[PDB]
Amino acid sequence: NLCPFGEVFNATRFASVYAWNRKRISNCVADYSVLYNSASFSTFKCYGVSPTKLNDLCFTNVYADSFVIRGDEVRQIAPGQTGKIADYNYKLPDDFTGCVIAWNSNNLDSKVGGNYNYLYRLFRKSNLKPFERDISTEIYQAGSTPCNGVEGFNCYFPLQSYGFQPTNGVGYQPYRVVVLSFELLHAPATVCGPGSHHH
Amino acid sequence: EVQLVQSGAEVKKPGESLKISCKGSGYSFISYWIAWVRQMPGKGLEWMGIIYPGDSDTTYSPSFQGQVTISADKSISTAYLQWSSLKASDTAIYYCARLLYYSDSSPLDSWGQGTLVTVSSASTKGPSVFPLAPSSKSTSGGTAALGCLVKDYFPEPVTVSWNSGALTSGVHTFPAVLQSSGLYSLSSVVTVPSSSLGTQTYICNVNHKPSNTKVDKRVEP
Amino acid sequence: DIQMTQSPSSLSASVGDRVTITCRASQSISTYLNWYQQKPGKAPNLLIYAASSLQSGVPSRFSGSGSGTDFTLTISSLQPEDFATYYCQQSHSTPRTFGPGTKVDIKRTVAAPSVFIFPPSDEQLKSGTASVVCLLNNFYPREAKVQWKVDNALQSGNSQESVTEQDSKDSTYSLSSTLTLSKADYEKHKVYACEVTHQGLSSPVTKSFNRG
Ligand SMILES: *[C@@H]1O[C@H](CO)[C@@H](O[C@@H]2O[C@H](CO)[C@@H](O[C@@H]3O[C@H](CO)[C@@H](O)[C@H](O)[C@@H]3O)[C@H](O)[C@H]2NC(C)=O)[C@H](O)[C@H]1NC(C)=O
Numbered sequence: 001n002l003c004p005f006g007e008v009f010n011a012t013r014f015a016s017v018y019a020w021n022r023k024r025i026s027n028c029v030a031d032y033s034v035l036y037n038s039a040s041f042s043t044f045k046c047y048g049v050s051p052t053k054l055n056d057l058c059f060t061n062v063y064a065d066s067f068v069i070r071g072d073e074v075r076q077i078a079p080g081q082t083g084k085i086a087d088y089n090y091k092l093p094d095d096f097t098g099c100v101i102a103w104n105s106n107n108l109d110s111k112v113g114g115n116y117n118y119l120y121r122l123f124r125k126s127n128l129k130p131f132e133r134d135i136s137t138e139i140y141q142a143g144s145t146p147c148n149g150v151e152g153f154n155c156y157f158p159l160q161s162y163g164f165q166p167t168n169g170v171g172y173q174p175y176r177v178v179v180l181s182f183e184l185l186h187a188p189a190t191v192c193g194p195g196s197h198h199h
Numbered sequence: 200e201v202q203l204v205q206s207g208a209e210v211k212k213p214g215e216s217l218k219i220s221c222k223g224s225g226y227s228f229i230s231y232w233i234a235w236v237r238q239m240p241g242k243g244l245e246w247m248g249i250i251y252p253g254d255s256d257t258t259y260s261p262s263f264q265g266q267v268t269i270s271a272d273k274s275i276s277t278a279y280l281q282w283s284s285l286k287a288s289d290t291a292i293y294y295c296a297r298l299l300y301y302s303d304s305s306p307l308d309s310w311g312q313g314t315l316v317t318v319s320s321a322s323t324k325g326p327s328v329f330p331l332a333p334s335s336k337s338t339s340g341g342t343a344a345l346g347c348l349v350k351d352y353f354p355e356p357v358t359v360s361w362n363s364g365a366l367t368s369g370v371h372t373f374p375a376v377l378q379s380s381g382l383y384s385l386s387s388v389v390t391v392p393s394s395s396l397g398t399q400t401y402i403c404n405v406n407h408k409p410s411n412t413k414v415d416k417r418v419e420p
Numbered sequence: 421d422i423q424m425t426q427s428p429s430s431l432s433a434s435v436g437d438r439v440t441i442t443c444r445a446s447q448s449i450s451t452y453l454n455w456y457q458q459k460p461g462k463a464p465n466l467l468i469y470a471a472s473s474l475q476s477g478v479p480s481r482f483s484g485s486g487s488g489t490d491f492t493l494t495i496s497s498l499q500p501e502d503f504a505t506y507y508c509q510q511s512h513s514t515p516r517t518f519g520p521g522t523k524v525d526i527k528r529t530v531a532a533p534s535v536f537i538f539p540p541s542d543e544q545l546k547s548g549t550a551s552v553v554c555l556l557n558n559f560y561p562r563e564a565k566v567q568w569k570v571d572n573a574l575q576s577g578n579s580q581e582s583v584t585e586q587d588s589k590d591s592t593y594s595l596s597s598t599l600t601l602s603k604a605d606y607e608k609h610k611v612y613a614c615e616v617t618h619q620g621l622s623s624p625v626t627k628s629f630n631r632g
Binding site: 373376 | 463515536
């Protein structure tokens with residue numbers, strides 16, 4: 001049962017980075033090098049592993065996190081980084097064991113006049129934990145006076161929409177991202193590679 | 200189906216340790232903070248503290264700091280509440296709850312069903328069943344009152360019926376109270392017409408499974 | 421600690437009524453305020469967060485408003501499922517704190533309690549303790565007071581009471597108060613009484629007996 005990787009990488013709709021969704025993958029065989037070779041990938045780094053080696057390995061469970069950002073921010077989807085995305089939207093742990101997959105989707109998530117549906121958290125009073133997810137739309141109190149709901153000075157709606165237009169620069173164009181994380185518990189491994197000892 | 204399920208009721212003695220659990224499913228357990236809330240008998244809600252399962256970072260309420268330990272085990276999607284020495288004042292219901300998110304109103308959008316913790320020095324003990332005898336004259340008219348006093352038992356589960364299951368109308372079995380002795384006391388009563396005091400007999404059927412006790416008690420004026 | 425207050429502490433309402441409950445904070449909390457519902461034997465359920473955001477799955481008849489120190493929960497048309505206790509909870513400061521809750525019982529005509537007093541049983545007296553019971557039957561509203569008198573001397577810290585939940589058929593309450601002494605001091609007095617006050621009683625009523 002080769003897993004539904006196409007269910008995630010080929011999903012017609014992707015989430016905003018602030019409300020990134022996670023797909024638990026389990027009970028299947030994973031052909032990671034076939035995923036590598038499906039190509040059209042501008043970023044494909046693995047931390048602590050190699051694709052070729054890991055489709056000989058198995059793990060307890062695998063998780064696929066997907067969302068949209070833009071080109072200049074994919075660097076933030078790496079361990080130990082800072083910035084609006086890593087600090088306020090999607091944070092990876094320093095001991096990350098997985099791969100980060102990203103590819104330009106300007107042909108799909110941009111439109112003439114701008115696609116404002118993709119959002120990202122602009123303000124947050126503390127940085128996120130690794131793999132924490134905060135979807136709060138409450139107005140952000142940037143100063144010492146309370147907002148009492150109303151938008152006003154020092155009181156901002158916390159989410160900003162990307163201005164995705166087909167004519168933006170490489171760094172301001174949409175990029176779909178998928179982060180695979182490999183969970184090895186002291187428990188039966190149910191996501192194996194074709195070349196593992198299990199198959 | 201986001202759900203939190205807590206472990207079952209607990210009956211301990213002062214000075215003992217206790218650990219209770221809260222298992223979460225239907226979502227990414229490491230990605231949301233978990234709160235613990237106390238509700239003492241007949242009281243409201245108290246925020247005890249919070250924990251982030253991803254790394255077990257905890258922030259306690261000052262009232263509970265150093266009085267209890269919040270921990271987690273992400274490998275089995277579980278959060279814990281733990282005491283090293285229980286006190287009678289710890290008798291209460293404890294809930295775990297997920298925070299929709301950490302910032303701003305930080306609302307508790309999904310709760311576990313609660314874990315009742317009872318701290319008492321007493322051991323399993325069957326009840327004493329005493330009559331609450333009516334004194335109303337049978338021909339006086341109006342209503343008469345009649346009951347049974349179920350005293351000094353432990354643990355909590357006790358059931359009482361009247362004339363087997365035949366008498367149910369006008370019955371009020373009250374919630375048990377925990378006496379200063381660490382033993383429960385309960386009263387069951389029924390109101391009946393004064394006239395009927397002269398024709399029908401009344402027997403309460405008290406059942407206490409923990410001590411395998413079954414007592415039938417007639418109540419006469 | 422921010423202190424949360426709710427008014428009224430108890431509310432009688434009928435199906436179809438528009439009900440409003442208020443919450444007050446001892447200092448401003450912007451709109452970092454949540455509302456929860458709790459029914460006996462159950463765990464709370466989130467109704468409103470951030471003062472006015474309706475939790476998904478919650479019926480539209482619930483709504484929240486307010487800011488700073490004043491907040492209100494409104495139910496447009498009270499339904500049978502809505503009789504319960506409602507708590508507010510501030511999230512402006514740590515520690516988080518809840519209001520004491522406001523129970524919303526079913527409205528009914530006022531009914532005065534039938535009161536009955538029960539002396540200790542001879543069996544119990546053999547064991548060295550005496551339990552005098554006072555019973556308040558089928559009253560509405562919930563508020564009632566029982567004071568034990570022994571030879572016209574009022575008792576304190578001497579009794580425990582317990583109240584039933586609102587009855588399903590007649591929507592009344594019932595209450596049991598248990599005064600307990602030892603055989604010794606029980607045998608030292610003659611008359612035992614419980615005085616009951618209730619909105620349905622024009623003047624306090626006393627049931628009593630003399631051991632003999
Ligand atoms: C997402 O969707 C794309 C497009 O459907 C997938 O591209 C697919 O890539 C595989 C090889 O990795 C192709 O399989 C081979 O294609 C040749 C075509 O000549 C065929 O003769 C071979 O027998 C074999 O089928 C597949 O055709 C191709 N799909 C299409 C319709 O072009 C991509 O792999 C998907 N990504 C994931 C992770 O699912």
